[PDB]
Amino acid sequence: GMFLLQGAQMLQMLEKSLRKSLPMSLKVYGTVMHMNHGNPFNLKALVDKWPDFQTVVIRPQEQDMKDDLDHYTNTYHVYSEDLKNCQEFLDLPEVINWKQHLQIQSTQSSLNEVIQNLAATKSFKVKRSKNILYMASETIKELTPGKPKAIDPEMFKLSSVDPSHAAVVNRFWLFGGNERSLRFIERCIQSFPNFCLLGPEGTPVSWSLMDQTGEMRMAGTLPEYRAQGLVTHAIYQQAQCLLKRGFPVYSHVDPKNQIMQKMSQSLNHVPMPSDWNQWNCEPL
Numbered sequence: 654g655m656f657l658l659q660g661a662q663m664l665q666m667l668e669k670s671l672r673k674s675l676p677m678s679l680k681v682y683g684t685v686m687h688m689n690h691g692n693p694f695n696l697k698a699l700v701d702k703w704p705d706f707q708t709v710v711i712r713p714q715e716q717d718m719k720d721d722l723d724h725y726t727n728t729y730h731v732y733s734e735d736l737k738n739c740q741e742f743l744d745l746p747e748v749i750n751w752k753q754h755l756q757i758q759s760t761q762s763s764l765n766e767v768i769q770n771l772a773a774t775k776s777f778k779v780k781r782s783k784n785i786l787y788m789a790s791e792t793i794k795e796l797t798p799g800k801p802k803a804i805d806p807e808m809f810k811l812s813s814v815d816p817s818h819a820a821v822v823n824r825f826w827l828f829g830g831n832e833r834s835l836r837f838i839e840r841c842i843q844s845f846p847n848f849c850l851l852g853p854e855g856t857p858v859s860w861s862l863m864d865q866t867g868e869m870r871m872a873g874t875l876p877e878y879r880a881q882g883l884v885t886h887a888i889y890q891q892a893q894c895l896l897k898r899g900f901p902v903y904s905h906v907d908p909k910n911q912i913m914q915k916m917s918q919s920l921n922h923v924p925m926p927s928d929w930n931q932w933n934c935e936p937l
């Protein structure tokens with residue numbers, strides 16, 4: 654079937670249920686936890702059955718998804734116990750609008766077979782990004798049962814990130830470099846607390862952001878200030894903030910990025926037996 658969850662009680666029940674399927678459910682779990690805190694991206698949680706769902710989809714509002722080309726906006730978060738149920742659910746036009754450029758995100762690699770099955774039926778092309786999934790050791794101990802080297806306090810200060818910094822974040826983001834990606838980064842900065850390090854000029858020189866899924870993403874250091882431990886400090890401070898508020902700490906790393914594999918090991922972030930996935934789907 655198809656049920657729209659409404660209210661904190663139902664979202665809290667969903668968040669509790671998803672804890673039993675971490676880390677495969679992590680991408681959905683993080684999204685729901687941040688929904689339960691003002692729902693700044695105006696998302697909604699769909700299930701095939703309630704309370705004992707087999708499939709959950711987090712999706713945006715139809716009237717926010719005006720630009721068929723804005724795959725940053727057109728993002729869906731999915732987790733399923735039953736791939737047949739999942740394929741029947743994603744087949745419903747009320748669940749996913751396959752006529753737009755869109756992104757499916759999941760920490761469940763087995764959905765690959767479902768998305769490939771629908772590509773035939775729904776007339777879309779798919780490109781998969783599959784990366785190493787990391788979780789903080791502390792999140793693993795809390796949900797599924799490491800300090801940086803110090804830096805010079807009169808050179809670097811912890812700061813909030815102004816929406817005006819989006820243009821710089823956008824220049825260094827592997828998925829960015831365009832106007833739609835800039836707008837998405839601005840929405841993440843406006844919606845969620847983020848950390849940067851200000852350098853000697855009071856300008857941001859290192860940063861780490863969070864998106865609507867609660868994942869730590871879009872981190873960078875200006876070339877002039879690289880290899881001094883700055884991004885490790887920014888991510889450490891972001892992670893401790895999330896942990897204090899009972900949010901999961903997680904991230905991913907492309908296998909090309911050895912630097913962020915090293916950073917992750919230094920902070921006791923652990924590679925998981927689930928992968929990070931993003932399926933980029935566009936109509937034929």
Ligand SMILES: CC(C)(COP(=O)(O)OP(=O)(O)OC[C@H]1O[C@@H](n2cnc3c(N)ncnc32)[C@H](O)[C@@H]1OP(=O)(O)O)[C@@H](O)C(=O)NCCC(=O)NCCSC(=O)c1ccccc1
Pocket residue numbers: 825826859861869870871872873874875878879880881882883884885886888904905906910911912913915916917919
């Ligand atoms: C952000 C980096 C990648 C690193 O920033 P920096 O401040 O320079 O890094 P640190 O100084 O803290 O060093 C860390 C470790 O690397 C080592 N090390 C460092 N440099 C080198 C070197 N050249 N050659 C060799 N080794 C080098 C250094 O010794 C240290 O080793 P230890 O940990 O002590 O064992 C920066 O180069 C950049 O902006 N790149 C482009 C954008 C991009 O790729 N962004 C990231 C996209 S992924 C993402 O967003 C994300 C992922 C997970 C969680 C959250 C988010």
